[PDB]
Amino acid sequence: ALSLTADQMVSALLDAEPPILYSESMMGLLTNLADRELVHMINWAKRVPGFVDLTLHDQVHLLESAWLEILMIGLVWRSMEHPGKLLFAPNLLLDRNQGKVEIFDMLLATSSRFRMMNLQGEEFVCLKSIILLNSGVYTDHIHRVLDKITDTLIHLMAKAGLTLQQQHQRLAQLLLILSHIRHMSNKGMEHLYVVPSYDLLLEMLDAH
Amino acid sequence: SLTADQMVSALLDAEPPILYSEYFSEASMMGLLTNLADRELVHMINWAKRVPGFVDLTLHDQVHLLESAWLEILMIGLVWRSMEHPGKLLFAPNLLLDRNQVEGMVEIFDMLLATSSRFRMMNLQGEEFVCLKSIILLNSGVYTFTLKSLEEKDHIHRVLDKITDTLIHLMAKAGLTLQQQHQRLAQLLLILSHIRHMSNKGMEHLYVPSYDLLLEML
Ligand SMILES: CCCN1CC[C@H](CSc2ccc([C@@H]3c4ccc(O)cc4CC4(CC4)N3C(=O)c3ccccc3)cc2)C1
Ligand SMILES: CCCN1CC[C@H](CSc2ccc([C@@H]3c4ccc(O)cc4CC4(CC4)N3C(=O)c3ccccc3)cc2)C1
């Protein structure tokens, strides 16, 4: 799994992207959307190179720690080309006045930062994979997979013609946004208080 | 226009002192810890004013950054002081606690010990530590802030890019390959995500310096 080249890493992550779901009272709608997204997030996670080499127990615990950050970065990515709004679904585009908002504004600020940086889709899927592997790690294989996502990000920035200086500056800019995504997830849990159970996540993993 | 070497030296020179507790009971512990944190906050203000680029910001923005970052900064300082003492948190040289020494305190205690362990595994260097602490100051509040606010953010990101350049410089100096430099840069910056996590958890557990207090010292 660690033998993939950088381009093969990118290709695998792009191929594993989950579909964009539609909405089926605001907060029942958004909860139900999140619930349906979580199954597709599990299928995605199983395709992040290195993830399924962990025990099922450690897979579940990484998902327990990461699932809200992953929903949020996906939302921010979708909303990136809709200034001042959040595209929860293609049939569910909300502005902040429908938000009444503190967390809404943080998400909008993240999407605008992504817009400023002209975040690329190949960079997005790497960041999402880092969240998966990193959010639960504090609580050797995981670190080896994280290092090769770093190698892959740097490879993408070199391919785009950035200087070596610009590469490390951009790498750092992107990883600092992950601190803000963590902050939003923490404030989001406080607001939503919700957590998918160990057994629910385990069932969606569909063990052999 | 500071070089990386000048950035490192300025940050090392700005380091606050390690403070002591007064010269044990569980019942007085939180009072001692709060008194220590209060005294450290005064020195943290002086340190912040010496982080290159910080005092170029408006007073209002300086307060907002410190408002967002002060707990993360106390926490990373504690983890650094604790790094050579496995299983312990060295709040002060005369206040060294283990995890057996309040509801929800041990959960945060454990996250801090895990950060200390991570520092040891990576053999974190003092020059890297001071860079990380300056990044926290400039970054933690930069997504929760007019033409003046756009100029401020620009400056903050230019200072952050300089610190990235400085970290890479330090790592290259230590003989790391270029792959190893990027890998370690990422490893260090991902630690900042965990420090943010502990700050949010800590705020929940502690429930704070006022703007006027921060403005008065600033
Ligand atoms: C078994 C039941 C457990 N399920 C139920 C709990 C657990 C799910 S709870 C839950 C999770 C997510 C949301 C949505 C939602 C939905 C889809 C998506 O892609 C993103 C978001 C973003 C956001 C999380 C911040 N959100 C809000 O509503 C929000 C947005 C901006 C400001 C404030 C609140 C809503 C509810 C799993
Ligand atoms: C008038 C403004 C009020 N002042 C404004 C600053 C003051 C704010 S409150 C406050 C801040 C800090 C702590 C200490 C403390 C002290 C010094 C230090 O270097 C680090 C720490 C770490 C830690 C914060 C997590 N802590 C705990 O006790 C703790 C530790 C592990 C698990 C759980 C709790 C304690 C209280 C109050």
From Swiss-Prot, chain A:
Parts of the chain that traverse the membrane: none
Location of region: Self-association: 1-208
Tissue specificity annotation: Widely expressed. Not expressed in the pituitary gland.
Residues with lipid group (S-palmitoyl cysteine): C126
Outcome after substituting G84V: Destabilizes the receptor and decreases its affinity for estradiol at 25 degrees Celsius, but not at 4 degrees Celsius
Compartments where found: Nucleus; Golgi apparatus; Cell membrane
UniProt-annotated binding residues for 17beta-estradiol: E37, R78, H191
PTM field: Phosphorylated by cyclin A/CDK2 and CK1. Phosphorylation probably enhances transcriptional activity. Self-association induces phosphorylation. Phosphorylated by LMTK3 in vitro. Glycosylated; contains N-acetylglucosamine, probably O-linked.
Region of interest called Interaction with AKAP13, as start-end residue ranges on this chain: 1-208
Domain NR LBD: 5-208
Function description: Nuclear hormone receptor. The steroid hormones and their receptors are involved in the regulation of eukaryotic gene expression and affect cellular proliferation and differentiation in target tissues. Ligand-dependent nuclear transactivation involves either direct homodimer binding to a palindromic estrogen response element (ERE) sequence or association with other DNA-binding transcription factors, such as AP-1/c-Jun, c-Fos, ATF-2, Sp1 and Sp3, to mediate ERE-independent signaling.
Membership in a protein family: Belongs to the nuclear hormone receptor family. NR3 subfamily.
Disease field: Estrogen resistance: A disorder characterized by partial or complete resistance to estrogens, in the presence of elevated estrogen serum levels. Clinical features include absence of the pubertal growth spurt, delayed bone maturation, unfused epiphyses, reduced bone mineral density, osteoporosis, continued growth into adulthood and very tall adult stature. Glucose intolerance, hyperinsulinemia and lipid abnormalities may also be present.
Name of the protein in question: Estrogen receptor
Whole-protein coverage range: 307 to 547 of 595
